[PDB]
Amino acid sequence: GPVPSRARVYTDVNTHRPREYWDYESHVVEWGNQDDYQLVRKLGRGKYSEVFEAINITNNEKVVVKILKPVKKKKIKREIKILENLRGGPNIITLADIVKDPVSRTPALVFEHVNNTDFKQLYQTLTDYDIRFYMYEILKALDYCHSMGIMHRDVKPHNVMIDHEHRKLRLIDWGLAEFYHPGQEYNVRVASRYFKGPELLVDYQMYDYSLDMWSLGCMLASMIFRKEPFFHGHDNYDQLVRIAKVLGTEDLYDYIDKYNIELDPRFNDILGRHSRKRWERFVHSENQHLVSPEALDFLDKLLRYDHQSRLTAREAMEHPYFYTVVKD
Ligand SMILES: COc1ccc(/C=C2\S/C(=N\c3cccc(O)c3)NC2=O)cc1O
């Protein structure tokens, strides 16, 4: 069988927390008053929810309301429990309330409002200094949630809300987040395709917080190299092939051999043989202002096949790439 794996940090956080902390199936929701909130405009829709701008009429403050579509109550309680556990943490979106929507007959989560710019437009604009600053702010959120025993499992640009005017950042959309427990096998159908870690793409279920660090590396690569998304696969199989054309096939085989993993035989006709590339090949005159030796070294240490070899969020915050960021 496959070789087991443990997180190298925050391994036992939930072990020594009280059961109530991570036992979300037993959580009892504290419902607020649904008539406190007036919906203003729809902001988005997905398979599992719709999101709205709204006004809290008890204080005339803007909020954001996510009205769930029907989904297992276990997963609704999981997201609620995680948001309450993380509330107040650095750059974590604040859950302000939970109400029952009378039309949907489902829960509606009420969040603080961020005056956001779309990443497609914001990313055409950020400077080298901006990218370092906001990467540091994301790391604060990720080290916090990892230190609290939670993996996000859907890190991607669409889930990082930035109010550039106030240099304010919030990590949102905790609907896929999970509690880390040593030895637990997790669903690999998480994260967006372009941000899926190799562990998901080879069906290794005993993964951990380090998944979020791969996803963050994909974001960093897209920003400093001006290629969004960086690994642009047409499906989950091609996604691994795109990664292997950069990291090389020999280290992919080292990875699956370490964990006694077997590749899907459908890769026999599509994977090929690929050397590992040097990151300098992705530098050109239109992105070199965003690239430095420090950026390439930092990126290189996030994008490792072996989830046990990636920088932790705390280690990443120690990296020389962040030396120029003003610390508060
Ligand atoms: C404009 O400011 C904000 C925007 C979003 C949030 C929080 C969200 S949105 C989400 N999930 C989605 C995303 C897209 C479509 C959809 O139907 C559901 N999960 C969250 O926590 C908070 C804000 O302050």
Coordinates of C-alpha atoms and ligand atoms in Angstrom, one line a residue:
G1 CA 0.0 0.0 0.0
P2 CA 0.9 3.7 0.0
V3 CA 3.4 4.9 2.5
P4 CA 1.7 7.1 5.2
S5 CA 2.5 10.8 5.7
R6 CA 2.3 13.4 8.5
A7 CA 2.5 17.2 8.4
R8 CA 5.9 18.3 9.6
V9 CA 4.4 21.2 11.6
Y10 CA 1.2 21.8 13.6
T11 CA 0.8 18.0 13.5
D12 CA -1.0 17.6 16.8
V13 CA -2.9 20.8 17.0
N14 CA -6.4 19.2 16.9
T15 CA -5.2 16.3 19.0
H16 CA -4.8 18.5 22.0
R17 CA -7.6 21.0 21.3
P18 CA -10.9 20.1 23.0
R19 CA -13.1 17.9 20.9
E20 CA -15.7 20.7 20.5
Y21 CA -13.0 22.6 18.6
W22 CA -12.8 20.2 15.6
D23 CA -16.0 18.1 16.0
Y24 CA -18.1 20.2 13.6
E25 CA -20.8 17.6 13.2
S26 CA -21.9 18.3 16.7
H27 CA -21.8 22.0 16.4
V28 CA -25.0 23.9 17.2
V29 CA -25.5 27.0 15.0
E30 CA -26.4 30.3 16.7
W31 CA -28.9 31.8 14.3
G32 CA -29.2 35.6 13.9
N33 CA -32.1 37.7 12.6
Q34 CA -32.7 37.3 8.9
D35 CA -34.6 40.6 8.7
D36 CA -31.4 42.5 9.7
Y37 CA -30.1 42.2 6.1
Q38 CA -31.4 43.7 2.9
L39 CA -29.9 42.2 -0.3
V40 CA -28.6 44.9 -2.8
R41 CA -27.1 43.1 -5.8
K42 CA -25.9 39.6 -6.7
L43 CA -22.1 39.4 -6.9
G44 CA -21.7 35.8 -8.1
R45 CA -23.0 32.2 -8.3
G46 CA -21.5 28.8 -8.0
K47 CA -22.6 25.2 -7.9
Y48 CA -23.1 25.4 -4.1
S49 CA -24.2 29.0 -3.4
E50 CA -25.0 32.5 -4.5
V51 CA -23.2 35.6 -3.1
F52 CA -24.8 39.1 -2.7
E53 CA -23.9 42.5 -1.6
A54 CA -26.2 43.5 1.3
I55 CA -26.8 46.2 3.9
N56 CA -27.0 45.4 7.6
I57 CA -29.9 47.8 8.5
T58 CA -29.2 47.7 12.2
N59 CA -26.0 49.7 11.5
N60 CA -26.3 50.7 7.8
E61 CA -23.0 48.8 7.1
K62 CA -22.3 46.9 3.9
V63 CA -22.0 43.2 4.3
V64 CA -21.7 40.2 2.0
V65 CA -24.3 37.4 2.1
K66 CA -23.5 33.9 0.8
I67 CA -26.8 31.9 0.5
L68 CA -26.0 28.2 0.2
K69 CA -27.6 25.9 -2.3
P70 CA -28.5 22.5 -0.8
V71 CA -25.4 20.6 0.4
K72 CA -24.7 18.1 3.2
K73 CA -25.3 19.7 6.6
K74 CA -22.0 18.2 7.6
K75 CA -20.2 20.5 5.2
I76 CA -22.3 23.6 6.2
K77 CA -21.4 23.0 9.8
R78 CA -17.7 22.4 8.8
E79 CA -17.5 25.8 7.1
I80 CA -19.3 27.5 9.9
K81 CA -17.1 26.0 12.6
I82 CA -13.9 26.8 10.8
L83 CA -15.0 30.4 10.2
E84 CA -15.8 30.8 13.9
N85 CA -12.6 29.1 15.0
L86 CA -10.5 31.5 12.8
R87 CA -12.5 34.7 13.4
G88 CA -10.2 37.6 14.3
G89 CA -7.1 36.0 12.9
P90 CA -4.8 37.9 10.6
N91 CA -6.4 38.5 7.2
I92 CA -9.1 35.9 7.7
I93 CA -12.6 37.0 6.4
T94 CA -14.9 37.7 9.4
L95 CA -18.1 35.8 9.6
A96 CA -20.5 38.3 11.2
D97 CA -23.7 36.3 11.3
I98 CA -25.6 33.2 10.2
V99 CA -29.3 33.4 9.2
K100 CA -32.0 31.2 7.7
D101 CA -33.0 32.4 4.3
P102 CA -36.8 32.0 3.9
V103 CA -36.7 31.6 0.1
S104 CA -33.8 29.2 -0.3
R105 CA -34.7 27.3 2.9
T106 CA -30.9 27.1 3.5
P107 CA -28.4 28.9 5.7
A108 CA -27.0 32.3 4.6
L109 CA -23.6 33.3 5.9
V110 CA -23.0 37.0 6.5
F111 CA -19.5 38.3 6.1
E112 CA -17.7 41.6 6.5
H113 CA -17.5 43.5 3.2
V114 CA -14.2 44.1 1.3
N115 CA -14.1 46.8 -1.4
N116 CA -12.4 44.5 -3.9
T117 CA -10.7 44.9 -7.3
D118 CA -11.0 41.8 -9.6
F119 CA -7.7 40.0 -9.7
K120 CA -7.6 40.0 -13.6
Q121 CA -7.4 43.9 -13.4
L122 CA -5.5 44.1 -10.1
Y123 CA -2.8 41.8 -11.3
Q124 CA -2.1 43.9 -14.4
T125 CA -1.2 46.7 -12.0
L126 CA 0.7 45.4 -9.0
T127 CA 4.4 46.3 -8.7
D128 CA 7.2 44.1 -7.5
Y129 CA 6.7 45.7 -4.0
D130 CA 3.0 45.2 -4.1
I131 CA 3.4 41.4 -4.9
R132 CA 5.8 40.9 -2.0
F133 CA 3.6 42.8 0.4
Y134 CA 0.4 40.9 -0.5
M135 CA 2.2 37.5 -0.6
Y136 CA 3.4 38.3 3.0
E137 CA -0.2 39.1 4.0
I138 CA -1.5 35.8 2.5
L139 CA 1.2 33.9 4.4
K140 CA 0.0 35.6 7.7
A141 CA -3.5 34.1 7.0
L142 CA -2.1 30.7 6.0
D143 CA 0.2 30.4 9.0
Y144 CA -2.6 31.4 11.2
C145 CA -5.1 28.8 9.9
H146 CA -2.4 26.1 9.7
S147 CA -1.4 26.9 13.3
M148 CA -5.1 26.5 14.2
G149 CA -5.3 23.1 12.7
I150 CA -7.1 24.0 9.4
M151 CA -6.1 23.6 5.7
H152 CA -7.8 26.0 3.3
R153 CA -7.7 23.6 0.2
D154 CA -8.8 26.3 -2.3
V155 CA -6.1 28.9 -2.5
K156 CA -6.4 30.8 -5.7
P157 CA -6.5 34.5 -6.8
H158 CA -10.4 34.5 -6.8
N159 CA -10.3 33.7 -3.0
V160 CA -7.9 36.6 -2.1
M161 CA -10.0 39.8 -1.7
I162 CA -7.8 42.9 -1.9
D163 CA -8.9 46.5 -1.2
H164 CA -5.9 48.1 -2.9
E165 CA -6.8 51.6 -1.7
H166 CA -6.4 50.6 2.0
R167 CA -3.8 47.8 1.3
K168 CA -6.3 45.4 2.9
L169 CA -6.4 41.7 2.2
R170 CA -8.8 38.9 3.2
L171 CA -8.6 35.2 2.5
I172 CA -12.2 34.1 1.7
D173 CA -14.2 31.0 0.7
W174 CA -13.6 28.5 3.5
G175 CA -16.1 26.1 1.9
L176 CA -13.5 23.4 1.1
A177 CA -11.4 23.9 4.3
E178 CA -10.8 21.0 6.6
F179 CA -9.4 20.1 10.0
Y180 CA -6.0 18.4 9.8
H181 CA -5.8 15.1 11.7
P182 CA -2.7 12.9 11.5
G183 CA -3.3 9.9 9.4
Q184 CA -6.6 11.0 8.0
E185 CA -7.3 10.4 4.3
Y186 CA -8.9 13.3 2.6
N187 CA -10.9 13.9 -0.6
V188 CA -8.6 14.7 -3.5
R189 CA -11.4 16.6 -5.4
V190 CA -10.4 20.0 -3.9
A191 CA -8.8 23.2 -5.2
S192 CA -9.2 24.6 -8.7
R193 CA -7.5 22.6 -11.5
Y194 CA -4.6 25.1 -12.0
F195 CA -3.8 25.2 -8.3
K196 CA -4.1 21.4 -7.5
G197 CA -1.0 20.0 -5.9
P198 CA 0.7 16.9 -7.3
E199 CA -0.6 14.9 -4.3
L200 CA -4.1 15.5 -5.5
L201 CA -3.2 14.7 -9.1
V202 CA -1.6 11.4 -8.2
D203 CA -4.5 10.5 -5.8
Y204 CA -2.5 10.6 -2.6
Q205 CA -5.1 11.2 0.1
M206 CA -3.0 11.6 3.3
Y207 CA -2.0 15.2 2.6
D208 CA -1.9 18.2 4.8
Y209 CA -1.4 22.0 5.1
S210 CA 1.4 21.8 2.5
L211 CA -1.2 21.6 -0.2
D212 CA -1.9 25.3 0.3
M213 CA 1.7 26.1 -0.2
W214 CA 1.7 24.5 -3.7
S215 CA -1.4 26.5 -4.6
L216 CA 0.4 29.7 -3.3
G217 CA 3.4 28.9 -5.4
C218 CA 1.2 28.6 -8.5
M219 CA -0.2 32.1 -7.7
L220 CA 3.3 33.5 -7.2
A221 CA 4.5 32.1 -10.5
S222 CA 1.5 33.6 -12.4
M223 CA 2.2 37.0 -10.9
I224 CA 6.0 37.3 -11.2
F225 CA 6.1 35.7 -14.7
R226 CA 2.8 37.4 -16.0
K227 CA 1.2 34.1 -17.1
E228 CA -2.2 33.4 -15.6
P229 CA -2.7 30.6 -14.9
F230 CA 0.9 29.4 -14.8
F231 CA 0.3 25.6 -15.2
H232 CA -2.6 25.7 -17.7
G233 CA -3.9 22.2 -18.0
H234 CA -6.9 21.2 -20.1
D235 CA -7.9 18.5 -17.6
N236 CA -6.6 16.9 -14.4
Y237 CA -4.3 14.6 -16.4
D238 CA -2.9 17.3 -18.6
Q239 CA -2.4 19.4 -15.5
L240 CA 0.2 16.9 -14.2
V241 CA 1.8 16.8 -17.6
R242 CA 2.1 20.7 -17.5
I243 CA 3.8 20.5 -14.1
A244 CA 6.2 17.7 -15.2
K245 CA 7.3 19.8 -18.2
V246 CA 8.7 22.3 -15.7
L247 CA 9.7 20.2 -12.7
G248 CA 10.7 17.2 -14.8
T249 CA 9.7 13.6 -14.9
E250 CA 12.5 12.1 -12.9
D251 CA 11.6 13.9 -9.7
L252 CA 7.9 13.0 -10.3
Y253 CA 9.0 9.4 -10.3
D254 CA 11.1 10.0 -7.2
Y255 CA 8.0 11.4 -5.5
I256 CA 5.6 8.6 -6.3
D257 CA 8.4 6.0 -5.5
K258 CA 9.0 7.6 -2.1
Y259 CA 5.3 7.1 -1.2
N260 CA 5.0 3.7 -3.1
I261 CA 2.4 5.4 -5.4
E262 CA 1.6 4.2 -8.9
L263 CA 0.6 6.6 -11.7
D264 CA -2.6 6.1 -13.5
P265 CA -1.8 4.0 -16.6
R266 CA -3.4 6.6 -18.8
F267 CA -0.3 8.6 -18.3
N268 CA 1.7 6.0 -20.3
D269 CA 0.9 7.7 -23.6
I270 CA 0.9 11.4 -22.5
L271 CA 3.6 12.0 -19.9
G272 CA 6.8 11.7 -21.9
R273 CA 10.3 12.4 -20.5
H274 CA 11.2 15.9 -19.4
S275 CA 14.2 17.5 -17.8
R276 CA 13.8 19.8 -14.8
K277 CA 13.9 23.4 -16.1
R278 CA 15.6 26.5 -14.6
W279 CA 13.2 29.2 -13.6
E280 CA 15.2 31.8 -15.6
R281 CA 13.7 30.5 -18.8
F282 CA 10.4 32.1 -17.9
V283 CA 12.0 35.6 -17.4
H284 CA 11.7 38.1 -20.3
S285 CA 11.7 41.8 -20.8
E286 CA 8.0 42.2 -19.9
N287 CA 8.2 40.5 -16.5
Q288 CA 11.9 41.0 -15.4
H289 CA 10.9 44.0 -13.2
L290 CA 8.9 41.4 -11.0
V291 CA 11.7 38.8 -10.9
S292 CA 14.8 38.7 -8.6
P293 CA 17.1 36.0 -7.4
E294 CA 15.1 36.0 -4.2
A295 CA 11.8 35.5 -6.0
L296 CA 13.0 32.6 -8.0
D297 CA 14.6 30.9 -5.0
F298 CA 11.4 31.4 -3.0
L299 CA 9.2 30.1 -5.8
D300 CA 11.5 27.1 -6.3
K301 CA 11.1 26.2 -2.6
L302 CA 7.2 26.3 -2.8
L303 CA 6.8 24.3 -6.0
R304 CA 8.2 20.9 -4.9
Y305 CA 6.5 17.6 -5.9
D306 CA 7.1 16.2 -2.4
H307 CA 4.6 17.9 -0.1
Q308 CA 7.0 17.2 2.8
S309 CA 9.7 19.3 1.1
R310 CA 7.8 22.5 0.6
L311 CA 8.4 25.6 2.7
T312 CA 5.9 25.9 5.6
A313 CA 4.1 29.2 5.8
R314 CA 6.3 30.3 8.8
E315 CA 9.5 29.3 7.0
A316 CA 8.2 31.2 3.9
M317 CA 7.8 34.3 6.0
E318 CA 11.5 34.1 6.9
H319 CA 12.6 34.1 3.3
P320 CA 14.9 36.9 1.9
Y321 CA 12.2 37.7 -0.7
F322 CA 10.3 39.5 2.1
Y323 CA 13.3 41.4 3.4
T324 CA 12.3 44.5 1.4
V325 CA 8.7 44.5 2.7
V326 CA 8.1 47.1 5.5
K327 CA 7.2 45.3 8.7
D328 CA 4.7 46.8 11.1
Ligands
LIG1 C1 -16.9 41.7 -2.2 O1 -16.4 41.4 -0.9 C2 -16.5 40.1 -0.5 C3 -16.7 39.0 -1.5 C4 -16.8 37.7 -1.0 C5 -16.7 37.4 0.3 C6 -16.8 36.0 0.9 C7 -17.0 34.9 0.2 S1 -17.6 34.6 -1.3 C8 -17.6 32.9 -1.3 N1 -17.9 32.0 -2.2 C9 -18.4 32.3 -3.5 C10 -17.7 32.9 -4.4 C11 -18.2 33.2 -5.7 C12 -19.5 32.8 -6.0 C13 -20.3 32.2 -5.1 O2 -21.6 31.8 -5.4 C14 -19.8 31.9 -3.8 N2 -17.1 32.3 0.0 C15 -16.7 33.6 1.0 O3 -16.3 33.5 2.1 C16 -16.5 38.4 1.3 C17 -16.4 39.8 0.9 O4 -16.3 40.8 1.8

